Design a protein around this ligand. Structure first.
Ligand SMILES: OC[C@H]1O[C@@H](O)[C@H](O)[C@@H](O)[C@H]1O
Ligand SMILES: OC[C@H]1O[C@@H](O)[C@H](O)[C@@H](O)[C@H]1O
Ligand SMILES: OC[C@H]1O[C@@H](O)[C@H](O)[C@@H](O)[C@H]1O
Ligand SMILES: OC[C@H]1O[C@@H](O)[C@H](O)[C@@H](O)[C@H]1O
Ligand SMILES: OC[C@H]1O[C@@H](O)[C@H](O)[C@@H](O)[C@H]1O
Ligand SMILES: OC[C@H]1O[C@@H](O)[C@H](O)[C@@H](O)[C@H]1O
Lengths: 262, 259
């Protein structure tokens, strides 16, 4: 068995509102807090992280670390050997969760505003805790096709299934690195499920909360899952005439099957 | 001593019959149970017992015809096809496979193999660009007929080529990518036959690169970008697997996972 390789890629890290994991004011002094800063297009190192094969997410030799500072749960840059090893080790998940195994806490950004300092919180798969290690800092725009090859459409806070139309901006969806699904028409809004129980009809609500019912995960089985409650998107009664998409236990039927046709 | 057969017919086929077909195909190419980044990995060629090296797809159509394409569990590709009492194979790219394909349709006397291989490069030379070959229940229906009557001078090579590519895309590349399967579903859905668009072709073309990028990721992070294209031709980069989890469904074994 000839093992694979750990390429230790150098990527940015996009999160909430699609801002980047940034080392504040480019200061690299042990303890300088890591924040969320609009993504850079140049090559500044304070926004470039190397995923070395030791589970550290170094940016200029300095480790993404959890500060043992006073209130705590703060995330800051810190000498990789100086720091408590455990506070520099992380795991980037496919679920789009960056978690510090040692604590079991996950990288989070309690605000969508720029400058918001990173903190590590308990995993509740909220948007605010979802990240993506990509040098591609734009939202993946696409249409989301479901049943009968129909498209997910948004009008105001409502989202139903309509027949796909080339123009139609209502059928354009921006898939943010944070795990949110936002209507191109208004990237301030989110594909939201204001409840974690079956039959809950999905709406288009403000992303401000960056709640768990706003983060989504496109699974390998064609379903769009909500990590938190475990339900999947579902065109109720496999009837797009009901103009209602809901969350429902995963069964796998085509009414729960989606495809980001880009 | 008989490989497994997944069945499918274009006769009053539905998005459900098709969906079940493709899942059944994947089901038989993945028994191995080796997933990575939520994406299943095809059995490793190297050291794979001939006994479990192939699976058969029996294809029937409105004209009550049936051909059986042979697929390599190793890469979900069609290696050969058997049309009734005839059986032809593509020209293998190595002594290794060349030996294997000779385990396929053995009781068939008129079994032989062409001088050309089954890769698109060749098949497109013989029959034309994928970007010009219509896909949908319609083509597959006819592709099946052609394949059936090739042994009886019913089918021209350029046509045999095309007949193959549509089956390969509609089957192998659909099994590989849920995006392609998805794309087929829509066609079947509306009885609207059409040619593969940039996004589809580029995907088929990147299957090998993707299988690799992904398996050699650090944590879903790519060492280097894989370029793809939107239906409108425009290309984009992908440095992360997350975006692909819902696109690709099968990957060719490229290396052993680190223990
Ligand atoms: O070698 C330097 C380059 O490494 C790449 O991984 C990174 O995405 C690029 O922006 C550049 O920093
Ligand atoms: O004021 C904070 C900002 O300071 C800039 O110098 C730096 O390049 C930015 O990434 C951000 O840290
Ligand atoms: O990267 C610079 C730092 O490297 C550490 O290994 C050393 O103990 C520290 O005092 C500081 O010099
Ligand atoms: O990177 C420079 C630093 O490297 C550390 O290993 C050393 O202990 C420090 O004093 C400083 O020289
Ligand atoms: O070890 C179990 C865990 O594995 C992670 O990769 C996955 O993202 C988590 O949701 C949980 O299933
Ligand atoms: O053993 C399973 C196989 O049995 C065959 O009789 C059937 O035609 C095939 O589609 C498959 O179901």
């Amino acid at each position: 068995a000839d093992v694979c390789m750990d390429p230790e890629p150098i990527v940015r890290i996009v999160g909430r509102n699609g801002l980047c994991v940034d080392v504040t004011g480019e200061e690299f002094f042990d303890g300088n807090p890591i924040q969320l800063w609009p993504c850079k297009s140049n090559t500044d190192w304070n926004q470039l992280w190397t995923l070395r094969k030791d589970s550290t997410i170094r940016s200029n030799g300095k480790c993404l670390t959890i500060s043992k500072s006073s209130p705590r749960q703060q995330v800051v840059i810190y000498n990789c050997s100086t720091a408590t090893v455990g506070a520099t080790r992380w795991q980037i998940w496919d679920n789009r969760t960056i978690i510090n195994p040692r604590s079991g806490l996950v990288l989070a950004a309690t605000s969508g505003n720029s400058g918001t300092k990173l903190t590590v919180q308990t995993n509740i798969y909220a948007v605010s805790q979802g990240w993506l290690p990509t040098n591609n800092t734009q939202p993946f725009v696409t249409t989301i096709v479901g049943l009968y090859g129909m498209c997910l459409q948004a009008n105001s806070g409502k989202v139903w299934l309509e027949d796909c139309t080339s123009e139609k901006a209502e059928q354009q969806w921006a898939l943010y690195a944070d795990g949110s699904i936002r209507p191109q028409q208004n990237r301030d809004n989110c594909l939201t499920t204001d409840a974690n129980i079956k039959g809950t009809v999905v709406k288009i609500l403000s992303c401000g909360p960056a709640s768990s019912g706003q983060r989504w995960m496109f699974k390998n089985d064609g379903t769009i899952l909500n990590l938190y409650n475990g339900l999947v998107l579902d065109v109720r009664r496999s009837d797009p005439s009901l103009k209602q998409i809901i969350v429902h236990p995963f069964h796998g039927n085509l009414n729960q099957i989606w495809l980001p046709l880009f | 001593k008989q490989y497994p057969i997944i069945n499918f017919t274009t006769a009053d086929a539905t998005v459900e019959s098709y969906t079940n077909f493709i899942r059944a195909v994947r089901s038989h190419l993945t028994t191995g149970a080796d997933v990575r980044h939520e994406i299943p990995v095809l059995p490793n060629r190297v050291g794979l017992p001939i006994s479990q090296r192939f699976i058969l797809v029996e294809l029937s159509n409105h004209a009550e015809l049936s051909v059986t394409l042979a697929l390599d569990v190793t890469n979900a590709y069609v290696v050969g096809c058997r049309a009734g009492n005839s059986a032809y194979f593509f020209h293998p790219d190595n002594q290794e496979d060349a030996e294997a394909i000779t385990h396929l349709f053995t009781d068939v006397q008129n079994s032989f193999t062409f001088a050309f291989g089954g890769n698109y490069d060749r098949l497109e030379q013989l029959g034309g660009l994928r970007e010009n070959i219509e896909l949908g229940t319609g083509p597959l229906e006819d592709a099946i007929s052609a394949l059936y009557y090739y042994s009886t001078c019913g089918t021209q090579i350029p046509t045999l080529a095309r007949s193959f590519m549509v089956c390969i895309q509609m089957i192998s590349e659909a099994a590989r990518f849920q995006y392609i399967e998805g794309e087929m579903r829509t066609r079947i859905r509306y009885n609207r036959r059409s040619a593969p668009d940039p996004s589809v072709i580029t995907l088929e073309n990147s299957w090998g690169r993707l299988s690799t990028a992904i398996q050699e990721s650090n944590q879903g992070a790519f060492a280097s970008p894989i370029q793809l294209q939107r239906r409108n031709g425009s290309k984009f980069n992908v440095y992360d697997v997350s975006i692909l989890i819902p696109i690709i469904a099968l990957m060719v074994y490229r290396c052993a996972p680190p223990p």
